[PDB]
Amino acid sequence: KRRVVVTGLGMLSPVGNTVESTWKALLAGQSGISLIDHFDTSAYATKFAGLVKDFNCEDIISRKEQRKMDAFIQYGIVAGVQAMQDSGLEITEENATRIGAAIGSGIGGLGLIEENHTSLMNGGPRKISPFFVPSTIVNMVAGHLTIMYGLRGPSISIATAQTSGVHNIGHAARIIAYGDADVMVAGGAEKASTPLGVGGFGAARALSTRNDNPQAASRPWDKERDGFVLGDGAGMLVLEEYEHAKKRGAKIYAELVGFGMSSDAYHMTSPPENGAGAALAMANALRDAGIEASQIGYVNAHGTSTPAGDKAEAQAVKTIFGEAASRVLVSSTKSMTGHLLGAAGAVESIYSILALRDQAVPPTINLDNPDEGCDLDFVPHEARQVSGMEYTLCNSFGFGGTNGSLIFKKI
Amino acid sequence: KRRVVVTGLGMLSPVGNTVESTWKALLAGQSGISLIDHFDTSAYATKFAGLVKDFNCEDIISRKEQRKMDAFIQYGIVAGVQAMQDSGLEITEENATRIGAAIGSGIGGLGLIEENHTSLMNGGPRKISPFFVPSTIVNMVAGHLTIMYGLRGPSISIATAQTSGVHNIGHAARIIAYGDADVMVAGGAEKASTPLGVGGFGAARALSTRNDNPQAASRPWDKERDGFVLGDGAGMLVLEEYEHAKKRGAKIYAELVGFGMSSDAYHMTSPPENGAGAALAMANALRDAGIEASQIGYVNAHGTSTPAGDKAEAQAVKTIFGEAASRVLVSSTKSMTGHLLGAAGAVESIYSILALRDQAVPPTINLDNPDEGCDLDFVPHEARQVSGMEYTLCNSFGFGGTNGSLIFKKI
């Protein structure tokens, strides 16, 4: 029976370019949301997002190699290098074959897709970059990292839209526990803050339009919610078989004990009013961990700040927690970070882990006026100190009614 | 110990719009390659591809719903419906929760990406479709099918470029064998025959430019190879836990016994000259099946018809088979079908299965003059009858040095 533990963390987010700086900001209730300036937003109904500030990879990726990669790829490689470094793992010829990667993205290289399509329209196929395909496709973060570190074990990339980060981490663990690997770098990367990303989610009327106050836009469970806020970033974890970790004297952040998946089988983009899908995913993770809902102390919600989605997740929590629905802490970091899509469940898994290390639960900021029949504790406004918390649960749901839940356990 | 078996098959390919018609064509050595006419190819160095002919979904997808989906999605849903129907499985409230999907794509909705970007350039963000995001993203075949059939078990979508079909089928099996599901519809869909797809792989100089003879272009291991040929399609299999299948009186095509993954850790798009990556993937699948290379009778190669890739796979076969390198049959159906990218390993897994049912191995057509140091039997020109073949192996390798191998066993 193989246990999986988290021994390395990496991260780029709208509130910090490292794991510790990101975490510190979240516990301080800071927003990472700001107005966009990298493209003309005049015609856009949403003119803001959660951006990665002063991103720099010069020391990690040559400007010459940068040409071959979309921003989402560069982000994911940087967060991957941070995680590899943090793990302290040494890759040997004897090792290579047993270390892999499970890293994806929801939308991939929109920026380079646009640039390449603009070239084609303006001057024909001759103007398309020879790097078009491999610079934009979702699996290239795992591609580049395995090459950089000489990793030869299994590499997959799960692209389940807004559920990717969770799915990738969950399967990286299945792979280790199955015996196909001893270590996996797992997570997601996204850089969808582009004319197509912003224009596209805006066309769907899914985005908040509160441009007069970008930092107050993201407000899960708040009566004045008006759609999600888009965020860029990457979250990576180094997952490792327990005995392997111990033997190397690895620093161990927490243990991955439960992974649950489900499908809404309802609508292509909207969640069912009763969150039955989210319920099954949480129910499946608990059964996989072999514990009861009552044992979870903190749920890092999907909580995107859409009228219908926030309401469906709340329904799902009540269904799963029932009695202890009020004693469990539930919060959406998306209130400060925005929605990182394919990277959401990856960064949120990290927050779920750090909440166990620090016994602190980040707040859901902007929750000035909660919905009515709410009996749940959404950790409004201020971070909460906790005491004997041994497990956290991370939710992610996505287009296609695809859901995932991960369960982390202290030590 | 849970066994996985294939109880349903679905398929759209350049040589047929059904499983049996496709298979019949391949055994007859027919090409599905033709000149493109859905876009002006004047400026294109490659003016042909493996197209799906007279595709029709009218009875399966309303014209009203079609608007919300890229061709690759419509293809995948149709192949999915065929597979569900072929399986005879009946979805009940007691069932729903135990049936899922693992379906992906390498590139996703290029056509709708282009259409939407063209609109944006021509008339601004206001012209972007509200369906932009969910009509193009890779996980929407699993999205739509789970909804269509009320499937509520696990849904994931692996996007590992040219390795997707294999990866998805392999993980759908891991999911069942793990206990997270009893049935999974698994596979891939691709429709990359677009200005960006054709122009993009052409910019990389990866495509064959033999336009004077489209049907002879794809010619794996042939001295006059000049790059791969692009093909469109979808391949879907219904995978099912053995006991569950038996109890329902399911028709069983074959058993899925081995799944292997590896990474080249070499180059972002090219394979290492020694095919060490492909070797490890095949080696891992054998160990997972717990059999010896000598036991495989037919290898459906990745065999894309590139100078370097064909040569690397041959090296990898010799390394793995050694002695029996000459006694194993190896063939590339891509010689007739073209390269279906994310759908390649899905349709090729189906051919690997049917070769067991019919004891017949499709040829590698166009192999007029093999490379030199070749001692391998590439089933040139004509299909081969075989006798006591109990196992087949299917290879898929992709950008990012990502590899997968699947092993099918008779009965």
Side-chain angles (χ1 to χ4, degrees), chain B residues 15 256 320 340 361 368 388:
Chain B
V15 290
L256 203 174
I320 304 285
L340 298 229
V361 172
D368 307 322

Side-chain angles (χ1 to χ4, degrees), chain A residues 14-344:
Chain A
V15 290
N17 293 353
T18 70
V19 172
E20 302 304 336
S21 58
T22 290
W23 181 232
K24 164 157 194 228
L26 292 179
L27 286 177
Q30 338 181 334
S31 185
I33 312 311
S34 67
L35 296 154
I36 292 164
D37 46 47
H38 62 281
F39 72 92
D40 189 345
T41 68
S42 320
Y44 290 76
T46 299
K47 318 177 142 64
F48 60 91
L51 302 162
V52 166
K53 265 106 358 191
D54 312 309
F55 169 64
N56 165 109
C57 60
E58 228 72 342
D59 31 345
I60 301 166
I61 313 158
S62 54
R63 303 103 201 212
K64 243 163 200 282
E65 276 301 287
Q66 275 172 64
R67 215 216 97 74
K68 313 184 189 168
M69 333 171 156
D70 185 80
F72 95 94
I73 285 168
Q74 309 177 6
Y75 284 2
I77 288 166
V78 165
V81 165
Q82 290 181 20
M84 280 311 280
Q85 280 172 8
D86 188 51
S87 70
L89 197 72
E90 250 140 30
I91 316 294
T92 65
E93 187 127 15
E94 220 107 330
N95 246 3
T97 260
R98 275 249 132 93
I99 309 145
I103 301 169
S105 185
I107 326 187
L110 284 179
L112 253 22
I113 275 164
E114 304 191 10
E115 170 173 303
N116 275 288
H117 190 72
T118 292
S119 295
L120 161 67
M121 292 217 236
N122 282 165
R126 276 305 183 64
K127 292 299 186 156
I128 297 162
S129 167
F131 302 107
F132 172 61
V133 177
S135 72
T136 62
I137 66 178
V138 150
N139 66 302
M140 299 301 172
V141 186
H144 292 297
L145 286 165
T146 60
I147 290 157
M148 305 185 21
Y149 285 86
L151 308 187
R152 302 202 304 135
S155 65
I156 63 167
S157 308
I158 300 176
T160 45
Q162 301 97 336
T163 309
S164 308
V166 147
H167 277 153
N168 274 289
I169 289 166
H171 287 285
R174 293 292 200 249
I175 296 175
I176 296 157
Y178 179 84
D180 281 333
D182 296 324
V183 184
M184 294 290 293
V185 206
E190 204 87 53
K191 208 296 178 176
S193 57
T194 78
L196 279 171
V198 178
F201 277 109
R205 294 185 68 239
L207 262 13
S208 150
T209 284
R210 193 171 266 144
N211 304 299
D212 58 60
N213 205 165
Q215 316 217 108
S218 202
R219 56 175 50 236
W221 305 290
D222 184 87
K223 284 194 189 149
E224 312 158 76
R225 279 177 326 229
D226 76 324
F228 84 95
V229 174
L230 198 55
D232 294 334
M236 305 285 156
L237 326 210
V238 170
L239 314 174
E240 195 167 357
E241 188 275 316
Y242 193 25
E243 296 303 339
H244 182 277
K246 277 169 151 190
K247 144 149 39 243
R248 41 176 309 246
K251 102 162 137 250
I252 299 166
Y253 289 102
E255 197 188 347
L256 203 174
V257 284
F259 170 47
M261 303 160 259
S262 82
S263 315
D264 287 348
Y266 177 70
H267 182 88
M268 83 184 46
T269 59
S270 297
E273 277 195 293
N274 90 294
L280 218 203
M282 286 181 295
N284 283 341
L286 285 156
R287 170 174 332 112
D288 186 49
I291 60 172
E292 288 208 301
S294 99
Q295 247 149 317
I296 295 306
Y298 170 54
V299 175
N300 184 98
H302 185 54
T304 70
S305 190
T306 67
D310 288 11
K311 259 185 226 293
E313 195 172 3
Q315 199 49 80
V317 175
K318 295 165 190 168
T319 303
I320 304 285
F321 302 82
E323 222 62 318
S326 26
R327 239 185 87 229
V328 67
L329 301 190
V330 182
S331 88
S332 169
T333 41
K334 292 190 169 61
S335 65
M336 297 164 278
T337 221
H339 194 340
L340 298 229
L341 318 172

Side-chain angles (χ1 to χ4, degrees), chain A residues 117-118 121 130 139-140 144 146 151-153 155 157-159 167 174 178 180 203 262-263 265 268 280 288 399 402, chain B residues 117-118 121 130 139-140 144 146 151-153 155 157-159 167 174 178 180 203 262-263 265 268 280 288 399 402:
Chain A
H117 190 72
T118 292
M121 292 217 236
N139 66 302
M140 299 301 172
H144 292 297
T146 60
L151 308 187
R152 302 202 304 135
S155 65
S157 308
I158 300 176
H167 277 153
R174 293 292 200 249
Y178 179 84
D180 281 333
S262 82
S263 315
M268 83 184 46
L280 218 203
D288 186 49
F399 283 178
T402 193
Chain B
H117 190 72
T118 292
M121 292 217 236
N139 66 302
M140 299 301 172
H144 292 297
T146 60
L151 308 187
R152 302 202 304 135
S155 65
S157 308
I158 300 176
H167 277 153
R174 293 292 200 249
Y178 179 84
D180 281 333
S262 82
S263 315
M268 83 184 46
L280 218 203
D288 186 49
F399 283 178
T402 193

Side-chain angles (χ1 to χ4, degrees), chain B residues 40-122:
Chain B
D40 189 345
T41 68
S42 320
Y44 290 76
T46 299
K47 318 177 142 64
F48 60 91
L51 302 162
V52 166
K53 265 106 358 191
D54 312 309
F55 169 64
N56 165 109
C57 60
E58 228 72 342
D59 31 345
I60 301 166
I61 313 158
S62 54
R63 303 103 201 212
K64 243 163 200 282
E65 276 301 287
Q66 275 172 64
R67 215 216 97 74
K68 313 184 189 168
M69 333 171 156
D70 185 80
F72 95 94
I73 285 168
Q74 309 177 6
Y75 284 2
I77 288 166
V78 165
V81 165
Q82 290 181 20
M84 280 311 280
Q85 280 172 8
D86 188 51
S87 70
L89 197 72
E90 250 140 30
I91 316 294
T92 65
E93 187 127 15
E94 220 107 330
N95 246 3
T97 260
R98 275 249 132 93
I99 309 145
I103 301 169
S105 185
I107 326 187
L110 284 179
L112 253 22
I113 275 164
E114 304 191 10
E115 170 173 303
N116 275 288
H117 190 72
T118 292
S119 295
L120 161 67
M121 292 217 236
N122 282 165

